[PDB]
Amino acid sequence: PTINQLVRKGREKVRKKSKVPALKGAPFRRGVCTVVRTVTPKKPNSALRKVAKVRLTSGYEVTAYIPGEGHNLQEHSVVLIRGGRVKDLPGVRYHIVRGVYDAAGVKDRKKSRSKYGTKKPKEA
Amino acid sequence: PKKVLTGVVVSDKMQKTVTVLVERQFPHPLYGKVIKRSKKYLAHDPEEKYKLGDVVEIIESRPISKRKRFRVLRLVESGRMDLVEKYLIRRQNYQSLSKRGGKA
Amino acid sequence: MVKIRLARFGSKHNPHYRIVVTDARRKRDGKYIEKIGYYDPRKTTPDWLKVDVERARYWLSVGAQPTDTARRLLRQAGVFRQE
Amino acid sequence: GRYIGPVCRLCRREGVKLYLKGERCYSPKCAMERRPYPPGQHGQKRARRPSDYAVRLREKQKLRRIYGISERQFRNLFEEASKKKGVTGSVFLGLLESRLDNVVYRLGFAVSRRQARQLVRHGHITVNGRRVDLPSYRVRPGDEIAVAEKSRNLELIRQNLEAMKGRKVGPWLSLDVEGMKGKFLRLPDREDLALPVNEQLVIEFYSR
Amino acid sequence: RNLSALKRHRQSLKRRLRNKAKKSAIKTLSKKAVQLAQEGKAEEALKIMRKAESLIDKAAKGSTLHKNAAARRKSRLMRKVRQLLEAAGAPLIGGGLSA
Amino acid sequence: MLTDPIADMLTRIRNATRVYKESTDVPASRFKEEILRILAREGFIKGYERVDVDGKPYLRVYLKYGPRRQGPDPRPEQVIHHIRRISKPGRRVYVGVKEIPRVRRGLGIAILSTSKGVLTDREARKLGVGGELICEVW
RNA sequence: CUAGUUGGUGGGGUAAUGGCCCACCAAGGCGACGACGGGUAGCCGGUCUGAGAGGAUGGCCGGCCACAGGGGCACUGAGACACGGGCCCCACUCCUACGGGAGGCAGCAGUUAGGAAUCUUCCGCAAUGGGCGCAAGCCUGACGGAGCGACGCCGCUUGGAGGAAGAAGCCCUUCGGGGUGUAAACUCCUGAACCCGGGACGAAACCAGGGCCACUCAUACUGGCUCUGACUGACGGUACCGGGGUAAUAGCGCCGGCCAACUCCGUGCCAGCAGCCGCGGUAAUACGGAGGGCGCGAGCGUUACCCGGAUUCACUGGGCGUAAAGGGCGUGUAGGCGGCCUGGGGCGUCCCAUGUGAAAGACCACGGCUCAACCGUGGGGGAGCGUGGGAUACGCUCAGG
């Protein structure tokens, strides 16, 4: 573009689009469970991914992954959403925070406990 | 210093008032080239002296009316519509570029 | 009313004032009209009180009214001594 | 809290001797003696061609574990030595050697850098009279670093200052083993230190 | 409750009334005069004008009219009056009028 | 039309040197001659001289090159490795005496046009002046 | 888009110019150089990032503006349309003998609601400063402080030396042995916490006695100097000093590649991991534990968001034959740009002086707190714009060729 053109139209600044309308551009949002279904993977992968429809306080109704070996989520259980998609589950854009509200932490988690919100086991 | 400006009378259609078209130049703050903008001032002409085409010196004054804070200090050079033309011709293109389009 | 007073500029337990010429109405630590000295309450250094008596006298020359404590420091730097 | 944990294991990981114990690190036991391979279940296995990162990483870790200092404090010294005029590399080392706790070690008061850290900490040290218990205290040129009078009688201090008889001292230092005093003459230069370090890579590591 | 400085409002009302009263007198006389000059009656037109002039300057004495507010009033007055008097006037009393 | 006479000349020169012409003509203009004056003084060109081509005024520009070389491609190193127009119509470029660039860490020059005449960056800095930044040579 | 709309004449109002407002007259003003309308915004010194250009930001602190439960209004005043002043309307709360009354924390603290989330119903008026008073002095949730919450930054703590060819436990193994590891145990020294004693700066004025000057008729007032001058601290018996004195919070993330750190066991497309590529269906360095390791250390890691990497909007600093990208071609408006010579002008352009560019920050220097973080003092640089003076090569303009 000519200098005179740049003067006329000028460069357009790039806009990024959010990937997590957890609204309020908040770090976390709490919602209520609606359906504790179990979706199936995509392209190659196969298994029974545990998911959950959630009615957020942000006014949005979303689907969220439930990390961990085994959960305890039910129909009207209160939960916290943290944002983070799941490559295999088209339509799931947030993970559920384990160890907060109604979502109990993972039992027998002896490693990456910071995630899977499980307290420090007392070594006998 | 009461600001003094020079421009052309592009309009003598009002009573005791004239429209002076003051031109201005300067370097673009980011691209540096010298660009040239322009503004119209309504100046007070009591004697109804100044006529369409005159180059005049405008002087910062005490408000005379709303949208009118300048008085015709003096005449710099009479007659020269070559300038009024640009201004009018430009007003003429406006007469379009909307739902129709400006001539050429 | 324009005054000549102190302005807290130290820090907790480490106060350091600034003999200043401000309008009576400003925050004490607000924008002053001019600085004309400084004062270290605890004389933590051999140089705990400068005053530029030249300027002070100018301000007093036109209504500057010193806080008591400000005057007492101005006196120390002999702003008043008329010998 | 600066590290505090097995230390001859760092000596080993850097595959180079580190005098993190003053004495012993001589008596056939610095472990770097008949066991200079890294700690852990894999130490004896063959090592692979390190990555440019690995190398710069290992180099910094060395230079740093030598002064038992936290990355946090270490880094700030570096960014300080980067702004100040003069070859960052050495300027950096100068500042590292100006730590009161280091000097004490350098002047023989303590056997190790850790020990010196404590002597400074537990008040057993002086700087122009006034005592200073801040290990990170920066000693300037022209400072007397004496042992605390009350401690001059301490068993520990008498041993070390004893064996210190004869032992020479860095050309940027000097000590009066009598009144257990010593002076920081000037900032040591890169040449003055026989550090198994290549600040070249340390600078480069903070470049990334 | 009770910020005894209600007194201020208490006084505002008085002052309001005191001012309001000065001005209405002013306006009344002003016209009164303008209207006399209007009808061409020299003498009494000026006679009244002088009162107007007076009340105005006194209004500016305290904080009623105050400032150039007074000045504006007088000029707009002496002007209107002398002009309207151009009907075979001849300012007799020539009171507030430098002939 | 000939939109930029100055740029036309720097190019004629850049073009001729790339094929190693001995001479090379460019329509004469007071200003262009002023520039060539520096080119010579700074030792970028053997020199130049007024001449008449087809009746019209021109300036012969005598090009200069390094010596012949070894190995393949014996072509001489250029004396004028670079020469780029800067200020150009519809994008004029002026600089204060504090903004006069330091070309090629000093090994190259920059020709300015000041109210004190056409000077090189060093000359300008001396005389403490600025002005339109005609070009850059090195 | 708009008729008080643009100008005029006369007039009102103001401290003052002015359609600011009014009567009459004329036929207007703005827009594509973006009017009008919609959306967003309190705006700014600065701050974060960046090699820079630039991008993002404007909470704390300072400057300005706006608002005061929402809307409107004036009074009093030097000053307000006036947070803790007034009037009316709004719905709501409370008292009511049902006619009628009374209210309005976006001040400090605190409650409640909402939220992932944000403090003491604290001490003090001693200091800074402020209002009234001749003064003594009174008032002062501004402020000076302490408190709660690694919420952030900075400092420090959780031992030092010796100590086996190397305990046990645990892990691996070619079953020889290797690792955790001088780590431990233990020995000696050191000795945070904790105890005992001393105990602060911040405070000197305002104003107990004496002596003295200026003005004066005065030894009447008023003002000052000085001396020996006296009173006063919330923090706080805290900082700090001296003596005594115990080996005495850790930890968190990670180890498939990006990316520094690998083995066994369990599991068997499960249970799970996951930022991307992907990993798990009986040998998994990718899941869970363990041993070992790497990183960092009331820290460590996650989530969210901004810039950096991203020259991935390119002014610095990119491109368009086939990768995304030449409009199908012309004519021409606005606009951008301009052969050779001379003269005038000096608008751009360049130079000098001067004014402004605040403070804070950034940079350099020196200094204060044991260092530093933090803070103080000083100096230097700086775009832009105002003013005066100057230059005239180039660009512009004018005249001539």
PDB file of N, CA, C and O (backbone and C1' of nucleotides) in Angstrom, chain F residues 3 5 28-31 89-90 92 94-98 113-115 128-132, chain G residues 315 336-342 348-352 381-383 390-395:
ATOM      1  N   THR F   3       9.143  11.831 -13.086  1.00  0.00           N
ATOM      2  CA  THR F   3       8.632  12.080 -11.748  1.00  0.00           C
ATOM      3  C   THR F   3       9.662  12.539 -10.681  1.00  0.00           C
ATOM      4  O   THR F   3       9.394  13.474  -9.919  1.00  0.00           O
ATOM      5  N   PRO F   5      13.698  13.506 -10.691  1.00  0.00           N
ATOM      6  CA  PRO F   5      15.019  13.670 -11.297  1.00  0.00           C
ATOM      7  C   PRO F   5      16.182  13.147 -10.468  1.00  0.00           C
ATOM      8  O   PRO F   5      17.080  12.504 -11.005  1.00  0.00           O
ATOM      9  N   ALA F  28      21.380  17.195 -16.948  1.00  0.00           N
ATOM     10  CA  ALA F  28      21.890  18.162 -15.983  1.00  0.00           C
ATOM     11  C   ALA F  28      20.851  19.055 -15.330  1.00  0.00           C
ATOM     12  O   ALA F  28      19.890  19.502 -15.963  1.00  0.00           O
ATOM     13  N   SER F  29      21.074  19.305 -14.045  1.00  0.00           N
ATOM     14  CA  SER F  29      20.227  20.161 -13.225  1.00  0.00           C
ATOM     15  C   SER F  29      21.175  20.701 -12.172  1.00  0.00           C
ATOM     16  O   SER F  29      22.011  19.941 -11.662  1.00  0.00           O
ATOM     17  N   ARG F  30      21.062  21.990 -11.846  1.00  0.00           N
ATOM     18  CA  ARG F  30      21.939  22.590 -10.825  1.00  0.00           C
ATOM     19  C   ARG F  30      22.051  21.642  -9.637  1.00  0.00           C
ATOM     20  O   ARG F  30      23.145  21.204  -9.272  1.00  0.00           O
ATOM     21  N   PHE F  31      20.891  21.324  -9.063  1.00  0.00           N
ATOM     22  CA  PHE F  31      20.779  20.446  -7.910  1.00  0.00           C
ATOM     23  C   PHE F  31      21.507  19.109  -8.055  1.00  0.00           C
ATOM     24  O   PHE F  31      22.218  18.686  -7.139  1.00  0.00           O
ATOM     25  N   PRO F  89       9.025  12.495  -3.526  1.00  0.00           N
ATOM     26  CA  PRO F  89       7.788  13.271  -3.687  1.00  0.00           C
ATOM     27  C   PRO F  89       6.667  12.480  -3.039  1.00  0.00           C
ATOM     28  O   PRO F  89       6.684  11.245  -3.066  1.00  0.00           O
ATOM     29  N   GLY F  90       5.704  13.155  -2.433  1.00  0.00           N
ATOM     30  CA  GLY F  90       4.654  12.388  -1.780  1.00  0.00           C
ATOM     31  C   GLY F  90       5.264  11.418  -0.771  1.00  0.00           C
ATOM     32  O   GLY F  90       5.086  10.196  -0.841  1.00  0.00           O
ATOM     33  N   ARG F  92       8.021  13.316   1.623  1.00  0.00           N
ATOM     34  CA  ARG F  92       9.197  14.111   1.873  1.00  0.00           C
ATOM     35  C   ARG F  92       9.746  13.732   3.258  1.00  0.00           C
ATOM     36  O   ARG F  92       8.991  13.412   4.177  1.00  0.00           O
ATOM     37  N   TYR F  94      12.337  15.128   6.257  1.00  0.00           N
ATOM     38  CA  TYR F  94      13.237  16.130   6.819  1.00  0.00           C
ATOM     39  C   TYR F  94      13.689  15.744   8.213  1.00  0.00           C
ATOM     40  O   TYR F  94      12.943  15.113   8.950  1.00  0.00           O
ATOM     41  N   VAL F  95      14.913  16.132   8.566  1.00  0.00           N
ATOM     42  CA  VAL F  95      15.447  15.824   9.886  1.00  0.00           C
ATOM     43  C   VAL F  95      16.123  16.995  10.587  1.00  0.00           C
ATOM     44  O   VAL F  95      16.732  17.857   9.952  1.00  0.00           O
ATOM     45  N   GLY F  96      15.995  17.010  11.909  1.00  0.00           N
ATOM     46  CA  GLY F  96      16.633  18.035  12.706  1.00  0.00           C
ATOM     47  C   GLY F  96      18.092  17.636  12.802  1.00  0.00           C
ATOM     48  O   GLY F  96      18.456  16.502  12.488  1.00  0.00           O
ATOM     49  N   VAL F  97      18.941  18.554  13.237  1.00  0.00           N
ATOM     50  CA  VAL F  97      20.362  18.257  13.323  1.00  0.00           C
ATOM     51  C   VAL F  97      20.639  17.155  14.339  1.00  0.00           C
ATOM     52  O   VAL F  97      21.694  16.527  14.314  1.00  0.00           O
ATOM     53  N   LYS F  98      19.678  16.906  15.222  1.00  0.00           N
ATOM     54  CA  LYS F  98      19.830  15.856  16.223  1.00  0.00           C
ATOM     55  C   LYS F  98      19.339  14.498  15.680  1.00  0.00           C
ATOM     56  O   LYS F  98      19.576  13.455  16.289  1.00  0.00           O
ATOM     57  N   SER F 113      19.995  18.166   2.244  1.00  0.00           N
ATOM     58  CA  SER F 113      19.868  19.439   1.553  1.00  0.00           C
ATOM     59  C   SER F 113      19.425  20.418   2.642  1.00  0.00           C
ATOM     60  O   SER F 113      18.300  20.358   3.123  1.00  0.00           O
ATOM     61  N   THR F 114      20.333  21.303   3.035  1.00  0.00           N
ATOM     62  CA  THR F 114      20.081  22.276   4.091  1.00  0.00           C
ATOM     63  C   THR F 114      20.009  23.698   3.562  1.00  0.00           C
ATOM     64  O   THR F 114      20.432  23.964   2.441  1.00  0.00           O
ATOM     65  N   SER F 115      19.483  24.617   4.367  1.00  0.00           N
ATOM     66  CA  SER F 115      19.407  26.005   3.923  1.00  0.00           C
ATOM     67  C   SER F 115      20.828  26.554   3.838  1.00  0.00           C
ATOM     68  O   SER F 115      21.038  27.710   3.478  1.00  0.00           O
ATOM     69  N   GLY F 128      25.978  22.338  12.201  1.00  0.00           N
ATOM     70  CA  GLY F 128      24.807  22.247  13.063  1.00  0.00           C
ATOM     71  C   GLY F 128      23.456  22.551  12.424  1.00  0.00           C
ATOM     72  O   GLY F 128      22.707  23.386  12.921  1.00  0.00           O
ATOM     73  N   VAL F 129      23.126  21.872  11.333  1.00  0.00           N
ATOM     74  CA  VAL F 129      21.851  22.115  10.670  1.00  0.00           C
ATOM     75  C   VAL F 129      21.217  20.821  10.194  1.00  0.00           C
ATOM     76  O   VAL F 129      21.864  19.777  10.163  1.00  0.00           O
ATOM     77  N   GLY F 130      19.945  20.900   9.821  1.00  0.00           N
ATOM     78  CA  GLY F 130      19.234  19.730   9.341  1.00  0.00           C
ATOM     79  C   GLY F 130      18.577  20.055   8.020  1.00  0.00           C
ATOM     80  O   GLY F 130      18.902  21.082   7.417  1.00  0.00           O
ATOM     81  N   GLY F 131      17.665  19.198   7.563  1.00  0.00           N
ATOM     82  CA  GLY F 131      16.975  19.446   6.305  1.00  0.00           C
ATOM     83  C   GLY F 131      16.594  18.182   5.567  1.00  0.00           C
ATOM     84  O   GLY F 131      16.914  17.089   6.025  1.00  0.00           O
ATOM     85  N   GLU F 132      15.910  18.329   4.432  1.00  0.00           N
ATOM     86  CA  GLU F 132      15.481  17.195   3.607  1.00  0.00           C
ATOM     87  C   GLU F 132      16.596  16.167   3.465  1.00  0.00           C
ATOM     88  O   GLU F 132      17.725  16.513   3.120  1.00  0.00           O
TER      89      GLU F 132
ATOM     90  P     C G 315       3.579  -0.082   7.352  1.00  0.00           P
ATOM     91  O5'   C G 315       4.153   1.299   7.900  1.00  0.00           O
ATOM     92  C5'   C G 315       4.452   2.413   7.033  1.00  0.00           C
ATOM     93  C4'   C G 315       5.484   3.298   7.689  1.00  0.00           C
ATOM     94  C3'   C G 315       6.746   2.540   8.087  1.00  0.00           C
ATOM     95  O3'   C G 315       7.704   2.581   7.050  1.00  0.00           O
ATOM     96  C1'   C G 315       5.975   3.832   9.915  1.00  0.00           C
ATOM     97  P     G G 336      -3.399  17.423  -2.318  1.00  0.00           P
ATOM     98  O5'   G G 336      -2.511  16.145  -2.661  1.00  0.00           O
ATOM     99  C5'   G G 336      -2.241  15.153  -1.657  1.00  0.00           C
ATOM    100  C4'   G G 336      -1.374  14.056  -2.220  1.00  0.00           C
ATOM    101  C3'   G G 336      -0.108  14.508  -2.928  1.00  0.00           C
ATOM    102  O3'   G G 336       0.976  14.710  -2.046  1.00  0.00           O
ATOM    103  C1'   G G 336      -1.258  12.990  -4.302  1.00  0.00           C
ATOM    104  P     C G 337       1.945  15.971  -2.272  1.00  0.00           P
ATOM    105  O5'   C G 337       2.730  15.618  -3.613  1.00  0.00           O
ATOM    106  C5'   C G 337       3.578  14.479  -3.640  1.00  0.00           C
ATOM    107  C4'   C G 337       3.990  14.140  -5.040  1.00  0.00           C
ATOM    108  C3'   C G 337       4.652  15.214  -5.877  1.00  0.00           C
ATOM    109  O3'   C G 337       6.008  15.439  -5.531  1.00  0.00           O
ATOM    110  C1'   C G 337       3.124  13.983  -7.201  1.00  0.00           C
ATOM    111  P     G G 338       6.646  16.888  -5.787  1.00  0.00           P
ATOM    112  O5'   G G 338       6.707  16.980  -7.370  1.00  0.00           O
ATOM    113  C5'   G G 338       7.410  15.980  -8.116  1.00  0.00           C
ATOM    114  C4'   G G 338       7.643  16.445  -9.525  1.00  0.00           C
ATOM    115  C3'   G G 338       8.374  17.777  -9.681  1.00  0.00           C
ATOM    116  O3'   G G 338       9.356  17.749 -10.705  1.00  0.00           O
ATOM    117  C1'   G G 338       6.250  17.856 -10.772  1.00  0.00           C
ATOM    118  P     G G 339      10.201  18.585 -12.090  1.00  0.00           P
ATOM    119  O5'   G G 339      10.603  18.772 -13.619  1.00  0.00           O
ATOM    120  C5'   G G 339      11.060  17.643 -14.378  1.00  0.00           C
ATOM    121  C4'   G G 339      11.771  18.073 -15.641  1.00  0.00           C
ATOM    122  C3'   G G 339      12.802  19.185 -15.593  1.00  0.00           C
ATOM    123  O3'   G G 339      14.059  18.758 -15.091  1.00  0.00           O
ATOM    124  C1'   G G 339      11.466  19.391 -17.537  1.00  0.00           C
ATOM    125  P     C G 340      14.867  19.716 -14.085  1.00  0.00           P
ATOM    126  O5'   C G 340      15.421  20.879 -15.026  1.00  0.00           O
ATOM    127  C5'   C G 340      16.495  20.633 -15.957  1.00  0.00           C
ATOM    128  C4'   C G 340      16.765  21.861 -16.799  1.00  0.00           C
ATOM    129  C3'   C G 340      16.982  23.170 -16.057  1.00  0.00           C
ATOM    130  O3'   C G 340      18.305  23.289 -15.558  1.00  0.00           O
ATOM    131  C1'   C G 340      15.550  23.527 -17.900  1.00  0.00           C
ATOM    132  P     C G 341      18.577  24.197 -14.262  1.00  0.00           P
ATOM    133  O5'   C G 341      18.400  25.679 -14.818  1.00  0.00           O
ATOM    134  C5'   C G 341      19.332  26.217 -15.759  1.00  0.00           C
ATOM    135  C4'   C G 341      19.043  27.674 -16.027  1.00  0.00           C
ATOM    136  C3'   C G 341      18.794  28.553 -14.813  1.00  0.00           C
ATOM    137  O3'   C G 341      19.995  28.971 -14.192  1.00  0.00           O
ATOM    138  C1'   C G 341      17.192  29.023 -16.496  1.00  0.00           C
ATOM    139  P     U G 342      19.970  29.420 -12.653  1.00  0.00           P
ATOM    140  O5'   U G 342      19.214  30.824 -12.672  1.00  0.00           O
ATOM    141  C5'   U G 342      19.786  31.943 -13.371  1.00  0.00           C
ATOM    142  C4'   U G 342      18.873  33.150 -13.335  1.00  0.00           C
ATOM    143  C3'   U G 342      18.320  33.608 -11.998  1.00  0.00           C
ATOM    144  O3'   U G 342      19.250  34.369 -11.252  1.00  0.00           O
ATOM    145  C1'   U G 342      16.628  33.738 -13.644  1.00  0.00           C
ATOM    146  P     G G 348       6.278  27.518   7.714  1.00  0.00           P
ATOM    147  O5'   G G 348       6.437  26.074   7.049  1.00  0.00           O
ATOM    148  C5'   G G 348       5.322  25.160   6.994  1.00  0.00           C
ATOM    149  C4'   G G 348       5.610  24.027   6.044  1.00  0.00           C
ATOM    150  C3'   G G 348       6.859  23.241   6.359  1.00  0.00           C
ATOM    151  O3'   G G 348       6.597  22.206   7.267  1.00  0.00           O
ATOM    152  C1'   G G 348       6.856  23.811   4.062  1.00  0.00           C
ATOM    153  P     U G 349       7.686  21.868   8.389  1.00  0.00           P
ATOM    154  O5'   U G 349       9.071  21.865   7.603  1.00  0.00           O
ATOM    155  C5'   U G 349       9.460  20.760   6.780  1.00  0.00           C
ATOM    156  C4'   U G 349      10.878  20.946   6.310  1.00  0.00           C
ATOM    157  C3'   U G 349      11.844  21.372   7.388  1.00  0.00           C
ATOM    158  O3'   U G 349      12.310  20.270   8.134  1.00  0.00           O
ATOM    159  C1'   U G 349      12.158  22.721   5.474  1.00  0.00           C
ATOM    160  P     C G 350      12.745  20.487   9.665  1.00  0.00           P
ATOM    161  O5'   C G 350      14.137  21.248   9.534  1.00  0.00           O
ATOM    162  C5'   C G 350      15.300  20.596   9.008  1.00  0.00           C
ATOM    163  C4'   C G 350      16.461  21.555   9.006  1.00  0.00           C
ATOM    164  C3'   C G 350      16.724  22.251  10.327  1.00  0.00           C
ATOM    165  O3'   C G 350      17.492  21.476  11.207  1.00  0.00           O
ATOM    166  C1'   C G 350      16.740  23.849   8.602  1.00  0.00           C
ATOM    167  P     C G 351      17.400  21.776  12.772  1.00  0.00           P
ATOM    168  O5'   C G 351      18.116  23.191  12.911  1.00  0.00           O
ATOM    169  C5'   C G 351      19.511  23.327  12.614  1.00  0.00           C
ATOM    170  C4'   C G 351      19.988  24.723  12.936  1.00  0.00           C
ATOM    171  C3'   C G 351      19.696  25.246  14.329  1.00  0.00           C
ATOM    172  O3'   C G 351      20.658  24.796  15.271  1.00  0.00           O
ATOM    173  C1'   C G 351      19.222  26.910  12.709  1.00  0.00           C
ATOM    174  P     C G 352      20.257  24.711  16.827  1.00  0.00           P
ATOM    175  O5'   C G 352      20.212  26.243  17.274  1.00  0.00           O
ATOM    176  C5'   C G 352      21.391  27.059  17.152  1.00  0.00           C
ATOM    177  C4'   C G 352      21.115  28.487  17.558  1.00  0.00           C
ATOM    178  C3'   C G 352      20.384  28.698  18.867  1.00  0.00           C
ATOM    179  O3'   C G 352      21.235  28.595  19.988  1.00  0.00           O
ATOM    180  C1'   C G 352      19.485  30.127  17.206  1.00  0.00           C
ATOM    181  P     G G 381      20.450  18.811  28.755  1.00  0.00           P
ATOM    182  O5'   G G 381      19.696  17.570  28.100  1.00  0.00           O
ATOM    183  C5'   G G 381      20.430  16.573  27.359  1.00  0.00           C
ATOM    184  C4'   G G 381      19.536  15.407  26.985  1.00  0.00           C
ATOM    185  C3'   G G 381      18.253  15.749  26.248  1.00  0.00           C
ATOM    186  O3'   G G 381      18.451  15.951  24.854  1.00  0.00           O
ATOM    187  C1'   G G 381      17.782  14.212  27.990  1.00  0.00           C
ATOM    188  P     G G 382      17.568  17.054  24.088  1.00  0.00           P
ATOM    189  O5'   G G 382      16.082  16.467  24.154  1.00  0.00           O
ATOM    190  C5'   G G 382      15.795  15.115  23.713  1.00  0.00           C
ATOM    191  C4'   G G 382      14.350  14.738  24.011  1.00  0.00           C
ATOM    192  C3'   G G 382      13.292  15.739  23.575  1.00  0.00           C
ATOM    193  O3'   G G 382      12.964  15.551  22.201  1.00  0.00           O
ATOM    194  C1'   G G 382      12.845  15.005  25.797  1.00  0.00           C
ATOM    195  P     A G 383      12.742  17.370  21.874  1.00  0.00           P
ATOM    196  O5'   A G 383      11.660  17.176  20.719  1.00  0.00           O
ATOM    197  C5'   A G 383      11.672  16.009  19.883  1.00  0.00           C
ATOM    198  C4'   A G 383      10.274  15.463  19.724  1.00  0.00           C
ATOM    199  C3'   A G 383       9.221  16.462  19.280  1.00  0.00           C
ATOM    200  O3'   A G 383       9.182  16.628  17.871  1.00  0.00           O
ATOM    201  C1'   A G 383       8.407  15.233  21.133  1.00  0.00           C
ATOM    202  P     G G 390      15.617  39.027  10.961  1.00  0.00           P
ATOM    203  O5'   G G 390      16.513  37.767  10.558  1.00  0.00           O
ATOM    204  C5'   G G 390      17.925  37.771  10.835  1.00  0.00           C
ATOM    205  C4'   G G 390      18.557  36.418  10.566  1.00  0.00           C
ATOM    206  C3'   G G 390      18.418  35.784   9.194  1.00  0.00           C
ATOM    207  O3'   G G 390      19.325  36.325   8.257  1.00  0.00           O
ATOM    208  C1'   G G 390      18.161  34.130  10.860  1.00  0.00           C
ATOM    209  P     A G 391      19.070  36.091   6.690  1.00  0.00           P
ATOM    210  O5'   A G 391      19.339  34.535   6.488  1.00  0.00           O
ATOM    211  C5'   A G 391      20.651  33.975   6.693  1.00  0.00           C
ATOM    212  C4'   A G 391      20.698  32.539   6.212  1.00  0.00           C
ATOM    213  C3'   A G 391      20.164  32.284   4.812  1.00  0.00           C
ATOM    214  O3'   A G 391      21.164  32.534   3.832  1.00  0.00           O
ATOM    215  C1'   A G 391      19.270  30.683   6.303  1.00  0.00           C
ATOM    216  P     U G 392      20.747  33.134   2.403  1.00  0.00           P
ATOM    217  O5'   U G 392      19.911  31.955   1.746  1.00  0.00           O
ATOM    218  C5'   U G 392      20.457  30.630   1.696  1.00  0.00           C
ATOM    219  C4'   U G 392      19.499  29.711   1.010  1.00  0.00           C
ATOM    220  C3'   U G 392      18.999  30.217  -0.336  1.00  0.00           C
ATOM    221  O3'   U G 392      18.883  29.143  -1.244  1.00  0.00           O
ATOM    222  C1'   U G 392      17.176  29.864   1.141  1.00  0.00           C
ATOM    223  P     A G 393      19.779  29.122  -2.574  1.00  0.00           P
ATOM    224  O5'   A G 393      19.615  27.634  -3.103  1.00  0.00           O
ATOM    225  C5'   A G 393      20.757  26.858  -3.472  1.00  0.00           C
ATOM    226  C4'   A G 393      20.550  25.421  -3.079  1.00  0.00           C
ATOM    227  C3'   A G 393      19.198  24.816  -3.417  1.00  0.00           C
ATOM    228  O3'   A G 393      19.094  24.388  -4.756  1.00  0.00           O
ATOM    229  C1'   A G 393      19.778  24.258  -1.203  1.00  0.00           C
ATOM    230  P     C G 394      17.686  24.522  -5.503  1.00  0.00           P
ATOM    231  O5'   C G 394      16.790  23.420  -4.787  1.00  0.00           O
ATOM    232  C5'   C G 394      17.136  22.018  -4.858  1.00  0.00           C
ATOM    233  C4'   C G 394      16.171  21.203  -4.029  1.00  0.00           C
ATOM    234  C3'   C G 394      14.704  21.521  -4.251  1.00  0.00           C
ATOM    235  O3'   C G 394      14.159  20.849  -5.352  1.00  0.00           O
ATOM    236  C1'   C G 394      15.132  21.452  -1.935  1.00  0.00           C
ATOM    237  P     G G 395      12.962  21.531  -6.152  1.00  0.00           P
ATOM    238  O5'   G G 395      11.745  21.440  -5.128  1.00  0.00           O
ATOM    239  C5'   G G 395      11.069  20.194  -4.909  1.00  0.00           C
ATOM    240  C4'   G G 395       9.917  20.373  -3.960  1.00  0.00           C
ATOM    241  C3'   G G 395       8.948  21.493  -4.301  1.00  0.00           C
ATOM    242  O3'   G G 395       7.986  21.141  -5.283  1.00  0.00           O
ATOM    243  C1'   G G 395       9.490  21.584  -2.000  1.00  0.00           C
TER     244        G G 395
END
